[PDB]
């Protein structure tokens, strides 16, 4: 019944977004455990998180049934110009924080490759090293913006 995006198959690595307010602007890494088959009673996918667990002692990685629209492929590998790109004020970035990626905007660049990032939904202003940031991309119409 539903035509899944081609990247979505059992075993596929994905980034997972949540509908919950406390996760606004985040992408958590995970993998697909199950998808609707052409033979199916659901329209949903089950995913397993890579860095979130059911329990704080860490015995079982968290699994969730999610909407297809909550998933996208892993962000594109950082290119060669993108390693040459300086991060600048105004840039849309994701910051690695609490073991997932959170979208924000660079508001200040300091020396020694450090920056301050504003997060609109949480009204937070947080400093990061360059190696904690990635340039933000969007998965739209089956392709990345900006493209690969």
């Amino acid at each position: 019944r539903i035509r899944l995006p081609p990247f979505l198959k059992p075993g596929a690595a994905v980034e997972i977004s949540s509908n919950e307010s406390g996760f606004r602007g985040s992408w958590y890494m995970g993998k697909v455990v199950a998808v609707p088959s052409s033979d199916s009673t659901t329209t949903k996918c089950e995913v397993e998180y890579t860095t979130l667990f059911f329990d704080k002692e860490g015995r079982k990685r968290l699994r969730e049934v999610v909407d297809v629209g909550q998933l996208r492929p892993p962000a594109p590998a950082v290119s060669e110009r993108e390693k040459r790109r300086e991060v600048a004020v105004g840039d849309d970035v994701d910051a690695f924080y609490s073991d997932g990626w959170w979208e924000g905007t660079v508001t200040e660049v300091m020396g020694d490759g450090r920056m301050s990032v504003y997060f609109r939904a949480s009204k937070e202003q947080i400093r990061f090293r360059r190696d904690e940031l990635r340039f933000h991309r969007e998965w739209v119409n089956g392709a990345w913006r900006p493209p690969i």
Partner: peptide, 10 residues
């Protein structure tokens, strides 16, 4: 280990 409870911001 990280859980939704210790990752979420609200």
């Amino acid at each position: 280990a990280r859980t939704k409870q210790t990752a979420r911001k609200s």
